[PDB]
Design a protein around this ligand. Structure first.
Ligand SMILES: O=C(O)CNC(=O)C(=O)O
Ligand SMILES: [Mg+2]
Ligand code: NI
Ligand SMILES: [Zn+2]
Length: 331
């Protein structure tokens, strides 16, 4: 069995290997990359996502989210307070202000220590989940706006034609902006490209150990667990590496820098934080190996998780027994 310790693997495809996206994902899996839940892909030196980032300041962040924490430094939830719209140029200036800028630090490990010590005492503002793309239309390799759609994959594997679309999302971050512990909708893959700016630190639990993280989460967030049998679908809970180590939960960590891709694998729980002003683009995708994970994915039916239009068909076809309850949660 390849990668039996579930380490995060890093790949350096050649320009030739970068042509066929599906083939390269299958290659990485042949080497055991999925066992970690997360992989890094460094593009060949010849490749670029677009020519420059000099003309992005007029993109609108219609609903910036202030991420307000509650709890203790290693075990907290966050809620998202909506703020007034602002442009990317306005947001960049805010991220670089004395109130929000990255503190002086020695290295990534020092900054990680400062994040876990101090995150809860601040409320950073995240421009998340913005439909759009920064890939040039002429970029033919690993262009996250030109991937095969999940609807087409389900149709190819299972024969059923379904409604829905699959487009990318932009994330504009600042110091301390945080992504809570989650797997993807319907335990899909994700791919994330860091277009510009400061790094993003990731934490990940191997898919084969995901239920250990869920059991810890029910212990640490006991009111939330009574409210919903899949409350990590709410995407609000944080648990630090120190707390994970104290409770024996298997995990790994890695820092993504600008110009790098990360892939999350089905049922790979992940969480993380941004080091400073940055912009990422991410999208969900599927492969044949996903189908079995989609059929077994948990679902939030309490009303909190509220998701895209396109998840309807995935539930309806892969999980017909759960469909009626889940749809009630959507309405
Ligand atoms: O970058 C972020 O804030 C969160 N991204 C992801 O969870 C991802 O790409 O799957
Ligand atoms: Mg612009
Ligand atoms: Ni994710
Ligand atoms: Zn719920």
């Amino acid at each position: 069995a390849q990668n039996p310790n579930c380490n995060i693997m890093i790949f350096h495809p050649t320009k030739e290997e970068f042509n066929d996206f599906d083939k390269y994902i299958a290659y990485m899996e042949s080497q055991g990359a999925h066992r970690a839940g997360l992989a890094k892909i460094i593009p060949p030196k010849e490749w670029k996502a677009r020519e420059t980032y000099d003309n992005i300041s007029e993109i609108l962040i219609a609903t910036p989210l202030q991420q307000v924490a509650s709890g203790r430094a290693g075990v907290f939830t966050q809620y998202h307070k909506k703020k007034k719209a602002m442009t990317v140029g306005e947001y960049r200036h805010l991220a670089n202000s004395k109130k929000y800028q990255t503190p002086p630090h020695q290295n990534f490990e020092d900054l990680e220590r400062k994040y876990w010590k101090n995150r809860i005492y601040n409320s950073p503002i995240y421009g998340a989940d913005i439909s759009g793309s920064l890939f040039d239309e002429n970029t033919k390799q690993w262009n996250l706006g030109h991937l095969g759609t999940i609807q087409d994959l389900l149709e190819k594997e299972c024969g059923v034609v379904i409604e829905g679309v699959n487009t990318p999302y932009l994330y504009f971050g600042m110091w301390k902006t945080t992504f809570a512990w989650h797997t993807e909708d319907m335990d899909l893959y994700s791919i994330n490209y860091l277009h510009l700016g400061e790094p993003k630190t990731w934490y990940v639990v191997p898919p084969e150990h995901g239920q250990r993280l869920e059991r810890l989460a029910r212990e640490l967030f006991p009111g939330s667990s009574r409210g919903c049998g899949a409350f990590l679908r709410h995407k609000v809970a944080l648990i630090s590496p120190t707390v994970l180590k104290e409770n024996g939960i298997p995990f790994n960590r890695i820092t993504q820098e600008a110009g790098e891709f990360m892939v999350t694998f089905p049922y790979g729980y992940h969480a993380g934080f941004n080091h400073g002003f940055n912009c990422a683009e991410a999208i969900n995708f599927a492969t044949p190996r996903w189908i079995d994970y989609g059929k077994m994915a948990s679902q939030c039916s309490c009303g909190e998780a509220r998701v895209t239009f396109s998840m309807d068909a995935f539930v309806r076809i892969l999980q017909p027994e759960r469909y009626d309850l889940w749809k009630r949660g959507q309405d």
